Scaffold this active site. Structure first.
Site, mmCIF file in Angstrom:
data_model
loop_
_atom_site.group_PDB
_atom_site.id
_atom_site.type_symbol
_atom_site.label_atom_id
_atom_site.label_comp_id
_atom_site.label_asym_id
_atom_site.label_seq_id
_atom_site.Cartn_x
_atom_site.Cartn_y
_atom_site.Cartn_z
ATOM 1 C CD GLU G 64 -3.053 0.779 -0.006
ATOM 2 O OE1 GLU G 64 -3.775 1.715 -0.398
ATOM 3 O OE2 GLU G 64 -3.127 -0.386 -0.458
ATOM 4 C CG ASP G 92 -3.592 -3.383 2.237
ATOM 5 O OD1 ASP G 92 -3.769 -2.778 1.160
ATOM 6 O OD2 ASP G 92 -4.526 -3.741 2.983
ATOM 7 N N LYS G 118 -14.610 -9.447 2.432
ATOM 8 C CA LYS G 118 -13.316 -9.378 1.759
ATOM 9 C C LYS G 118 -12.730 -10.770 1.564
HETATM 10 MN MN LIG Z 1 -6.459 -3.227 2.933
#
Ligand SMILES: [Mn+2]
Ligand SMILES: C[C@H](C[C@@H](C[C@H](C[C@@H](C[C@@H](CCN1CCCC1=O)N1CCCC1=O)N1CCCC1=O)N1CCCC1=O)N1CCCC1=O)N1CCCC1=O
Ligand SMILES: C[C@H](C[C@@H](C[C@H](C[C@@H](C[C@@H](CCN1CCCC1=O)N1CCCC1=O)N1CCCC1=O)N1CCCC1=O)N1CCCC1=O)N1CCCC1=O
Ligand SMILES: C[C@H](C[C@@H](C[C@H](C[C@@H](C[C@@H](CCN1CCCC1=O)N1CCCC1=O)N1CCCC1=O)N1CCCC1=O)N1CCCC1=O)N1CCCC1=O
Ligand SMILES: C[C@H](C[C@@H](C[C@H](C[C@@H](C[C@@H](CCN1CCCC1=O)N1CCCC1=O)N1CCCC1=O)N1CCCC1=O)N1CCCC1=O)N1CCCC1=O
Ligand SMILES: C[C@H](C[C@@H](C[C@H](C[C@@H](C[C@@H](CCN1CCCC1=O)N1CCCC1=O)N1CCCC1=O)N1CCCC1=O)N1CCCC1=O)N1CCCC1=O
Ligand SMILES: C[C@H](C[C@@H](C[C@H](C[C@@H](C[C@@H](CCN1CCCC1=O)N1CCCC1=O)N1CCCC1=O)N1CCCC1=O)N1CCCC1=O)N1CCCC1=O
Ligand SMILES: C[C@H](C[C@@H](C[C@H](C[C@@H](C[C@@H](CCN1CCCC1=O)N1CCCC1=O)N1CCCC1=O)N1CCCC1=O)N1CCCC1=O)N1CCCC1=O
Ligand SMILES: C[C@H](C[C@@H](C[C@H](C[C@@H](C[C@@H](CCN1CCCC1=O)N1CCCC1=O)N1CCCC1=O)N1CCCC1=O)N1CCCC1=O)N1CCCC1=O
Ligand SMILES: COc1cc(CCNC(=O)c2[nH]c(-c3ccccc3C(F)(F)F)nc(=O)c2O)ccn1
Ligand SMILES: COc1cc(CCNC(=O)c2[nH]c(-c3ccccc3C(F)(F)F)nc(=O)c2O)ccn1
Ligand SMILES: COc1cc(CCNC(=O)c2[nH]c(-c3ccccc3C(F)(F)F)nc(=O)c2O)ccn1
Ligand SMILES: COc1cc(CCNC(=O)c2[nH]c(-c3ccccc3C(F)(F)F)nc(=O)c2O)ccn1
Ligand SMILES: COc1cc(CCNC(=O)c2[nH]c(-c3ccccc3C(F)(F)F)nc(=O)c2O)ccn1
Ligand SMILES: COc1cc(CCNC(=O)c2[nH]c(-c3ccccc3C(F)(F)F)nc(=O)c2O)ccn1
Ligand SMILES: COc1cc(CCNC(=O)c2[nH]c(-c3ccccc3C(F)(F)F)nc(=O)c2O)ccn1
Ligand SMILES: [Mn+2]
Ligand SMILES: [Mn+2]
Ligand SMILES: [Mn+2]
Ligand SMILES: [Mn+2]
Ligand SMILES: [Mn+2]
Ligand SMILES: [Mn+2]
Ligand SMILES: [Mn+2]
Ligand SMILES: [Mn+2]
Ligand SMILES: [Mn+2]
Ligand SMILES: [Mn+2]
Ligand SMILES: [Mn+2]
Ligand SMILES: [Mn+2]
Ligand SMILES: [Mn+2]
Ligand SMILES: [Mn+2]
Lengths: 179, 179, 179, 179, 179, 179, 179, 179
Positions: G64, G92, G118
């Protein structure tokens, strides 16, 4: 990445590059694809920065390098404290000494064609116009070049230095035939 | 925290904010409650900082931005080396070029009312008075504006930029009707 | 440590203090004992620093603040390139604009007594002499004060600020009656 | 390492030393062997840096301190925007105010011999010539010394300071008899 | 200014002093008058800073050094994520490793009297208590000293260094007989 | 200046040099004359700095590098919080982990002679002794070398690097035959 | 500007804000309009930054905070040197110690709903999943929370500090009911 | 300039580039012509820098990144304090923990061919050998990889990131077929 992009990152200082990335993305363009537009906005950003550095201490208010809304805020504050007419399009600088906005153009065509086209787009007569080109030629409204010969000749030199660096990397030709 | 406070911290540079917090607390006020007074002292602090930046190298001694005792010490040293009369209240600057103290006021009323009220509070005629407002209007004693037109017009623009930012955040109205 | 020493470290910026410690130790004195001499060399160092800051960009060569051998080297290089007479004692500055060395004195007596005593010690007439005092009075050779009124009045103010700070800490009296 | 090299690293600031190392290595010399050439290019680099610092803000384009190809690029951009003749050899500066290139020489012989030899090598009459020496003497084309007396006298002093430091370290004699 | 104040500014680093000025003013006290309270909060601030530096990387959340509202916010966030009881009064640290808040006291009386008095004020048994004194003695709840012997002995040394410096400046006696 | 002095300034970082200049001048010596003593105190200062860097985060209190009075203050605070015996002479470090002071010696003789001589001068048995030499040999009390093999071998390498640099500049011989 | 935007700029450090502006604009969103998405990406960016700071020195590769193409390059280099499966969507972080990618989610719903959604979008089972929420609750795959309790509890506290600051500015409610 | 050179300047941090320019020029090569050798020494320099960063605090003495004479000085000091055999060629690191020098190779062939060739050139068996490649494969002497799996896998990833960036700029093929 592109070859031009790498040249942009190694020829222009990082602050100018960051501003160019922010400016293009605020208008939907991506520096990694429209790479010669990336070099153009970087070149245009450096020219205006040198231009306002050419004056005293605080002769110029820099309009370029801000986002559209903050740039219009300064335009509003300038107009509604000095009394000048608010321009139709966003200028690049505001000359307090001369009490007029400036639009700065950097072209790879003849200074005559580029001035004529932007003088057509501006139409509002108040704001000053000043064009440079990558050959060392410049043209300004009423032949009033605002700055002295030493400051403007620094800008012409930097422009010819960029064109030279682009040519040795084989990218000047596409940069020329893309404006 | 307040909405105005967050605007104060994002519009004024941290050094000006720290000075404003120190100045208000030395007079019993809290920046987190009297938040529009917080914006006022910040605005007043920036205006005086730009004002003394408008001169040569060391034309101005900055009185504002120091605590009451250190500010009176410089006032004493100024008075008892130049020979000028010691003012009844603390000024904001001291002009060596003009050999006079300056009181700088930033108002949201008419420059005429604000000048009259502080010229009443000062009474001591020696110290110069110079008012700006968030509309771009200014007024000075004997029409002697000390600085040149370019420096003062920078201050008027910054003021109108602040009022614009306050209005888009819905806080200009309470800021206006609170002075 | 002493009370005066703590005042010296909190009133003068660290670079001036470091130079004063180096200067006194190169002559056998200890800042922690001869503390009012410590404040004197600090005050003298700041005055000369402000003095050379009072000119253009490179009007002055600073002699003070270097060790005896390096300071004499610049004195030699100055003398043997301009042609001026090499002074008997180390001056504090060299004015290129006026082509003369300057000796700067900061006194707590009358500018008349202090000038007379150092004009006696110098004897070599070439080098300029310029005295300030903690009351705001100054005296220079041929009444040629080298700098403009604004720069010199900054120095007089700083001096009166120091005397005020010393007095509120009860150390001005011994500082006065120690020169 | 050599004794001269250690003196070079302690007398000239690191940026000048790094440029001198880069300049000599680009021509096959090694700073650790040709150590008095190492001191010469450092001295020559500092003189040109002080020289361009002697003007306004952007009077001079510094040619020295860049590699051969980038230095010729600026030379090209200067020539092909101002219109001046491109020099046969690389100059050290470009004076925009006077519209001419400058070649700066620092010698340990008579300013007359050194000027004559380089005026012979240049042959191209356009570019200005300006020589300093470690004794405080200078000579320029048409007796046009470009800078004012204060800036040039700073350069002569720095040069005599270097010669003094070299002599106390016993290295001036070989430095003299090596040019 | 006071003699103690000058000692406070020369013994504690500026960030600790700024926090102490902010902390006292938020409770109506003035550092320039209550000067030994000024030294106390500075000493207390440095001790807690060294204390949390005594752990790993992020063992401690520093409660001290924030204003009352932001400090209670972290207290709230700590309590309402770990599950511990919210203390009646503001602690100084929060030990994640040990899952408990810490109150740190620096005294000039016997560690027994000072612990007893604050253990009385706290009443809430959860938060840990840890006292140091200017003689090198320490006392903690359940004899659980949280940190290792090396970190705590650094704190005791710094405290005895401060008392020594105060004594040589004749200010330890009033500092002792003022708690 | 001397050749050794220039080597000292180019081999040791400026902070170590400044401390060495301050240390020698506090004992009446001048770095520009007793230049090999100048290199010795610099070398001794770097060794102790690397030594305390060899531990955890705050295992060591650095005694060396402070002036005599401040160094004795920390010695006092250490002694009168841990309980150890106050040494007759100033040590260089204090090991909290091992609860003992350390005297660090850097010699150009045999580690046996140098240890014996300082163990004679110390007489007070408590403080630890640790010697290095420019050949890579070390000796410590009770063969307790405090640090691990990796940290001590870094120190031996740095020492042999200094001796090598001195030899190539022809100054090792006088440095050896001067201790 | 918006009230939320001003809060975002005063609560998150500038580097996190710049990354959030760059991240949203690369997906067509404008921080000045989608302001609660602006706060979300800032919060998500800070959480991942604290997360990778929770390990050793280089346990984590931060995915990220990079643009889509450079982030996929590191993903490629990670996959094609360790051998792990290339994820369908951008994670990430990458945990070298555990040899698995991490997806970090910050939610204002129940950690159960957000994880489930998710985990549904990921489908690729290899990459680890770790959710935090603004109430202090966390959930990870196989109950393997990667970091120790101290590091994760720092993240939960920072999250509850943000929710508290949003609530006192009346912006938490719209922030909650916008995910 | 070349396209590869611009990529080298935008992918490797400036300090690594400066060292590579200095290293190649000390062996007669020019970074602007042998540009893929320019990328190789940069890559090799970064790998060794990450390698020594993979240890404790001072496990490694960095041999690479110094000029030939200073690098041999540390080699001498290492050999003549630890007792190890002085290598025939310059290594890149020295592992104190393992008491052995390391030669680090970065190849675009099979780790087997590259190891065999340098193990042939070294011949001196003492110094350790460790090879990485742009595919993620590594090989070390006695299968002793010195560092842990996490540190080495960071190096393999960085290498594959460089190869990816070279390929998207069309320069990987010539870089591969040039070793
Ligand atoms: Mn995330
Ligand atoms: C070298 C020097 C830098 C200066 C450019 C200019 C940069 C920024 C101000 C900084 N930023 C960033 C965003 C918010 C903000 O305030 N911008 C951009 C909009 C107008 C402006 O001022 N700066 C910084 C110092 C003062 C100044 O003019 N110059 C001047 C010479 C060429 C050059 O690069
Ligand atoms: C940008 C630049 C900053 C300058 C403001 C001003 C700031 C301080 C001096 C620093 N401080 C802090 C307390 C002790 C102290 O000395 N203050 C406040 C009291 C008067 C004064 O000088 N500074 C700093 C550099 C010189 C100077 O004028 N300027 C000038 C342009 C607008 C602006 O912000
Ligand atoms: C604020 C600014 C600082 C400047 C003082 C002066 C300081 C030094 C140069 C630095 N040092 C230290 C030793 C070697 C060296 O070079 N000294 C001392 C001897 C003469 C000299 O230049 N500086 C530094 C920048 C240029 C300059 O003049 N000024 C000027 C205003 C008041 C003041 O403090
Ligand atoms: C003190 C000040 C420094 C300045 C010298 C000069 C240095 C560099 C620019 C920096 N570099 C390094 C390579 C790429 C680059 O851009 N060089 C060298 C080529 C021409 C040039 O500008 N600098 C830096 C700031 C502006 C400037 O003129 N000065 C001026 C006084 C004496 C001195 O040392
Ligand atoms: C030397 C080092 C500094 C550090 C103290 C501490 C300082 C601040 C954080 C900075 N500030 C200022 C206000 C907003 C803000 O964030 N404060 C105060 C409240 C808690 C906190 O962290 N710092 C800064 C870096 C990280 C850190 O812990 N240390 C640690 C050793 C002794 C010491 O002085
Ligand atoms: C590189 C790093 C620097 C550090 C040395 C040491 C320096 C000073 C502290 C700074 N000063 C100067 C006087 C007042 C003061 O506080 N001194 C000297 C007396 C003891 C001490 O700490 N520093 C500074 C940061 C922390 C520290 O240990 N190190 C450690 C590795 C080798 C080296 O040089
Ligand atoms: C405080 C410290 C900062 C650090 C965050 C992180 C920042 C950047 C690296 C810098 N940038 C910017 C773009 C190119 C680049 O390289 N990013 C973003 C992508 C991954 C990464 O590393 N940094 C900087 C130093 C090392 C590091 O991890 N941390 C860690 C604690 C919380 C925090 O903010
Ligand atoms: C980021 C960090 C930098 C560090 C690399 C390394 C750099 C230099 C030391 C600095 N220089 C320059 C020449 C004289 C000198 O001393 N070199 C090169 C030779 C060996 C050495 O140390 N540095 C600087 C700080 C300490 C250190 O190891 N690292 C470590 C991680 C990757 C990286 O880049
Ligand atoms: C960033 O890209 C953009 C931006 C806008 C709106 C804001 N822009 C200006 O106000 C503007 N725009 C241009 C320009 C126009 C077309 C192509 C390239 C440029 C150029 F040179 F940037 F490179 N020249 C100027 O001088 C000028 O002041 C429109 C379109 N594109
Ligand atoms: C910080 O708050 C204070 C401070 C004081 C004493 C010192 N102050 C001045 O010397 C002063 N004070 C004001 C002023 C007065 C009332 C409200 C707001 C302001 C204003 F603008 F700051 F915002 N204007 C000036 O121009 C001015 O020089 C009194 C009262 N309040
Ligand atoms: C550092 O202490 C010293 C130094 C010297 C030799 C170098 N000094 C000067 O060249 C010098 N010395 C003095 C002076 C003389 C006596 C007491 C105090 C001072 C004063 F003001 F510094 F505080 N005034 C000047 O103006 C002046 O230029 C002699 C004696 N003491
Ligand atoms: C770096 O070394 C070099 C470099 C070159 C090519 C570029 N150089 C110049 O353009 C140049 N070169 C010299 C000079 C000439 C011979 C010896 C020493 C110097 C001197 F002073 F540097 F020290 N003087 C100038 O003024 C000057 O502008 C040639 C030869 N050697
Ligand atoms: C800043 O001044 C204040 C502040 C408060 C509220 C916040 N303070 C604490 O939470 C607190 N306050 C004290 C303390 C108490 C009385 C005198 C001096 C101190 C001492 F040590 F600071 F110097 N010790 C602690 O350990 C402690 O955590 C109350 C009163 N005075
Ligand atoms: C600065 O010069 C001095 C200082 C003092 C008093 C403080 N010094 C120590 O405490 C001390 N002094 C020495 C030492 C002794 C004689 C010559 C050289 C050194 C040496 F190595 F510095 F280079 N070695 C140590 O290890 C040591 O701890 C005495 C004499 N000279
Ligand atoms: C800078 O260029 C050079 C330098 C030298 C002498 C010092 N060099 C080493 O000690 C060395 N040299 C190489 C290497 C060898 C040939 C081509 C490229 C490299 C490589 F990888 F740098 F890119 N690999 C290593 O691992 C290594 O330690 C020889 C030749 N060329
Ligand atoms: Mn524009
Ligand atoms: Mn334009
Ligand atoms: Mn005021
Ligand atoms: Mn005012
Ligand atoms: Mn003097
Ligand atoms: Mn004097
Ligand atoms: Mn040249
Ligand atoms: Mn030349
Ligand atoms: Mn507390
Ligand atoms: Mn406490
Ligand atoms: Mn010692
Ligand atoms: Mn010792
Ligand atoms: Mn190598
Ligand atoms: Mn290698």
């Amino acid at each position: 990445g592109s070859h031009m992009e790498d040249f942009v990152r190694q020829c222009f200082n990082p602050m100018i590059v960051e501003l160019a990335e922010k400016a293009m993305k605020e208008y939907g363009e991506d520096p990694k694809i429209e790479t010669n537009k990336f070099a153009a906005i970087c070149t245009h950003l450096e020219v205006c920065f040198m231009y306002s550095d050419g004056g005293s201490k605080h002769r110029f208010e820099i309009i370029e390098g801000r986002d559209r809304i903050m740039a219009w805020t300064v335009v509003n504050s300038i107009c509604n404290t000095t009394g000048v007419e608010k321009p139709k399009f966003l200028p690049d600088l505001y000359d307090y000494k001369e009490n007029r906005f400036i639009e700065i153009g950097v072209t790879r065509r003849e200074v005559h064609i580029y001035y004529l086209e932007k003088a057509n787009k501006i139409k509002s007569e108040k704001t000053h116009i000043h064009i440079f080109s990558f050959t060392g030629e410049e043209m300004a409204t009423k032949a009033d070049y605002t700055l002295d010969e030493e400051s403007r000749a620094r800008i012409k030199t930097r422009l010819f230095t960029i064109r030279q660096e682009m040519a040795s990397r084989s990218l000047w030709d596409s940069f020329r035939q893309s404006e």
